[PDB]
Amino acid sequence: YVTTGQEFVRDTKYIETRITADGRDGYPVEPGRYRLIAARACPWANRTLIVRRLLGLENVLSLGLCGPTHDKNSWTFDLDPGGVDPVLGIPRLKDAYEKRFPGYPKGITVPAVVEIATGEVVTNDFPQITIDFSLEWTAYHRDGAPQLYPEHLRAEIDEVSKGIYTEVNNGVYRCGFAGSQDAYDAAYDRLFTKLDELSERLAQQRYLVGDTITEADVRLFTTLARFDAVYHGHFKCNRSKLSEMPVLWAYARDLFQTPGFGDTTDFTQIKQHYYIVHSDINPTQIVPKGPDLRNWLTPHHREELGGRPFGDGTPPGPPIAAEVVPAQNWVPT
Amino acid sequence: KYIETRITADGRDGYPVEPGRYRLIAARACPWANRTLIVRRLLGLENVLSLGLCGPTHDKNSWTFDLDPGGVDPVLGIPRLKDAYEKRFPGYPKGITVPAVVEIATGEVVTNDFPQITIDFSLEWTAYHRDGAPQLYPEHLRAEIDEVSKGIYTEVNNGVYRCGFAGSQDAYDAAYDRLFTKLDELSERLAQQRYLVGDTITEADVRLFTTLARFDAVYHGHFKCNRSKLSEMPVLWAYARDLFQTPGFGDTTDFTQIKQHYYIVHSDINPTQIVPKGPDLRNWLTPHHREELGGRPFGDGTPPGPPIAAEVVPAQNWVPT
């Protein structure tokens, strides 16, 4: 994904169709009807996983997981018996996009939500997808699900999240995929200015917006989770490691240790994906054995800043057994 | 395989020590050469052994003098170091390496055997040491220095190369383990003890320092030696900063040219040839509290003064103030 001598500019051609309570676009919410396709590697998809997990939608929206590696045709189901998705029965996700738009020319991405009976991709617009879990699937939330996107905060959530998106979520990509020293230099500065900006903010406050975990924290978390494991070396975002940024590190560990976050995070598949798939940046395709992950489970003292994580909700229980991250792929006990 | 000819007090190989006769060629980038620089600097040999510096970047013909007026070495007058090896061995087929010591009048490489070169500064140039030069390789410690240094060489100095240049995951994995086992071994040792061997800075500390100096800037990312950054290894980091802040060490260290060399020359590992702008170097100048462990750095010697003016590291290339 690197254009030589050029800044990395992302191609945002998504399928914007929505799954909604009223069924406006021809796709009403109902249990057993749709299936979420994701990968532990990709941070956009990893939000979907966390959100689904926080709202208890496991029993009503099925989940398929792609393997971290693949060729030019994008995600495949190579971790699975048969090399095919248990439910959809396809070997690669492109078939699901094909079934809807024969010849689909745009990017074949995760997360994607597929309608089961038809085998067709409904949507892959990951920012709208996570909102729609909070707003449209509201009838099937578990008791104690939180308000990740309550009306009275959306303005603030939206302004913070756009900042983070451009400067951080995508900031890291804009560094790593930079095709020139100068492009890279510019990204590096914007990235670390922002992180300082966010350090100041979170010194003052347990979470990004208000009193509670919200959609903003989730979006930020998927990037910090990948920082030391990938972005720091692979993408050369290397002013300093995350673990050397006192407040952001503490914030990160607070979220990681919060149920529904760290339990969605597979460090082996994350590394494998970046270091092996991006052969243009790392042609040896050797995956670093570091970093040592144990520091993630160390005490953060963010409780001392107050807040209620779930805010008159409850933490979810542990994941269903097929969605648990293998112990060897997680932090060592 | 090196050129094993020696420059020696007795002149055994036809190359006696004398001032003004030889010139050391080095590069700020290469850690083998960087020892040379430190040692020369600790023993006050600046005024009697001249110094040329190569630029960090070059073609398949190795080191060039492209930081210098004219694109040539001030004294030798050559554009690339290969010429100096050529003038001695006209087909020279082996590696064109720094550090190299060149005899000025003739323009020929005398030696590039870097482990022997630094010993020979301590032992053979002894008559031209400044007052207060230390004993980096005293007879009564050599055994211990030698055994420690060999361990460090294979597991660490050369450990990092074996990771970065590994041609397979498994090769890499093996190098990674040996590397970090050793660094733990050394952490244990330096917890109780201010320096590696005995009471004093010695040849061992110098050899270890050139590698730690490059760890966070290069080896950690570029070579993927990434269990943890140096700055997260409490004792080794404190040891490293103690040496860095010791005159003759940090003042020989150019972080810009180090990074430039690894990240640009090794296109096979890093084909964008983009040089990271990190890490932030300021932590190097922070307090280490190793004085509490006792020791005398120079051991009835004195620290050297600051470097001669053409040997100072440009401020922009060093740590920021």
Breaks (C-N over 2.5 A) in chain B follow: none
| Order of strands, sheet of B22-27, starting from the edge strand that comes earlier in the sequence | B50-54, B22-27, B100-103, B108-111
Tokens 């020929």 belong to residue? B108
Q: How far, in Å, CA of A328 to CA of A254, rounded?
A: 22
The experimental technique used to determine this model is: X-ray
Given the DSSP bridges, would you call strands A120-123 and B50-54 parallel, antiparallel or unpaired?
unpaired
Structure tokens at B90: 């006209």
Render A297-311 in DSSP notation, one character per residue: GS----GGG---SSS
Q: Which of residues 154-183 of A touch B (CB under 8 A)?
A: 178-181
Q: How far, in Å, CA of A272 to CA of B40, rounded?
A: 45
**Contact indicator for A214, A157 with CB cutoff of 8 Å:** yes
Query: With contacts defined as CB-CB under 8 Å, which chain B residues touch A180?
Result: 274
Cα-flanking dihedrals φ and ψ of residue B168, to 5°? -165, 150
Q: How far, in Å, CA of B321 to CA of B315, rounded?
A: 9
Q: How far, in Å, CA of A225 to CA of A265, rounded?
A: 8
> What contacts B77, CB < 8 A, 6 or more positions away?
none
Of B15, B92, B128, B161, the active-site residue reads B161
Render B25-49 in DSSP notation, one character per residue: EEESS-HHHHHHHHHHHHTT-TTTS
Q: Which of residues 248-287 of B touch A (CB under 8 A)?
A: 268-269, 271-280
Residue B227 touches chain A, beta carbons under 8 Å: yes
**Contact indicator for A122, A17 with CB cutoff of 8 Å:** yes
Residue in A172, A188, A191, A236 to test binding to B, most B beta-carbons within 10 Å: A236
**Contact indicator for A291, A229 with CB cutoff of 8 Å:** yes
Cα-flanking dihedrals φ and ψ of residue A159, to 5°? -75, -40
Within 10 angstroms of residue A146's Cβ, the number of other Cβ atoms is 23
**Annotated binding residues of B for glutathione:** 63
Render B134-176 in DSSP notation, one character per residue: --SS-GGGHHHHHHHHHHHIIIIITHHHHHHT-SSHHHHHHHH
How does DSSP classify residue B301?
A: S
Cα-flanking dihedrals φ and ψ of residue A171, to 5°? -50, -45
SS3 label, residue A326? coil
- For residue B172, give the nearest of B182, B162, B181 by alpha carbon: B162
Annotated active-site residue B137? The verdict is no
Of B2, B22, B30, B176, the active-site residue reads B30
Instruction: Tell me if B176 and A290 make a contact (CB, 8 A cut-off).
Output: yes
Structure tokens at A188: 């590096």
How many residues are recorded in chain A?
A: 333
Side-chain half-sphere exposure of B72, counting CA atoms within 13 A: 9
**Contact indicator for B169, A287 with CB cutoff of 8 Å:** yes
> What contacts A28, CB < 8 A, 6 or more positions away?
A19, A20, A21, A22
Q: Which residues pair with B190 in a beta bridge?
A: none
Q: Which helix (DSSP H) or strand (DSSP E) does residue B191 occupy? A: helix B169-192
Structure tokens at B153: 């060489």
Angle at the Cα of B220 (from B218 to B224), degrees rounded to 5? 110
> Domains, chain A, ranges and CATH?
1-156 (3.40.30.10), 157-333 (1.20.1050.10)
Of A42, A66, A175, A237, the active-site residue reads A42
Instruction: Tell me if A240 and B278 make a contact (CB, 8 A cut-off).
Output: yes
Side-chain half-sphere exposure of B2, counting CA atoms within 13 A: 16
Q: How far, in Å, CA of A29 to CA of A25, rounded?
A: 11
Cα-flanking dihedrals φ and ψ of residue A243, to 5°? -60, -5
> What contacts A14, CB < 8 A, 6 or more positions away?
A106, A123, A124, A125, A126
Closest CA of chain B from A299, distance in Å: 17
Side-chain half-sphere exposure of B156, counting CA atoms within 13 A: 26
- PDB resolution in Å: 2.8
> What contacts A182, CB < 8 A, 6 or more positions away?
none
Within 10 angstroms of residue B134's Cβ, the number of other Cβ atoms is 23
Structure tokens at B160: 């990092």
Structure tokens at A220: 């930020």
Q: What is the CA radius of gyration of chain A?
A: 19
**Helical spans, DSSP H, in A91-137:** 94-100, 126-135
Torsion of CA A160, A165, A167, A172, to 10 degrees: 150
Distances (CA, A) of B137 to A211, B8, B9, B103, B134: 63, 16, 16, 25, 9
Residue A5 touches chain B, beta carbons under 8 Å: no
Burial (CB count within 10 angstroms: exposed 0-12, middle 13-18, buried 19+), residue B36: buried
Torsion of CA A137, A140, A143, A145, to 10 degrees: -30
SS3 label, residue B179? helix
How many helices (H) does chain B have, and how many strands (E)? 9, 4
Q: How far, in Å, CA of A311 to CA of A36, rounded?
A: 27
Taking each helix axis as running N to C, give the angle between helix B114-123 and helix B31-42, from 0 to 180 degrees, rounded to the nearest 10: 0
Q: How far, in Å, CA of A14 to CA of A52, rounded?
A: 21
How many residues are recorded in chain B?
A: 321
Side-chain half-sphere exposure of A316, counting CA atoms within 13 A: 22
- For residue A98, give the nearest of A112, A78, A84 by alpha carbon: A112
Closest CA of chain B from A290, distance in Å: 4
Q: How far, in Å, CA of B177 to CA of B143, rounded?
A: 27
Closest CA of chain A from B16, distance in Å: 47
Q: Compute CA A116 distance to the chain's CA centroid, rounded to the nearest angstrom.
A: 23
Q: How far, in Å, CA of A313 to CA of A259, rounded?
A: 13
Query: With contacts defined as CB-CB under 8 Å, which chain B residues touch A241?
Result: 229, 232
- End-to-end alpha-carbon separation of chain B, Å? 42
Residue A291 touches chain B, beta carbons under 8 Å: yes
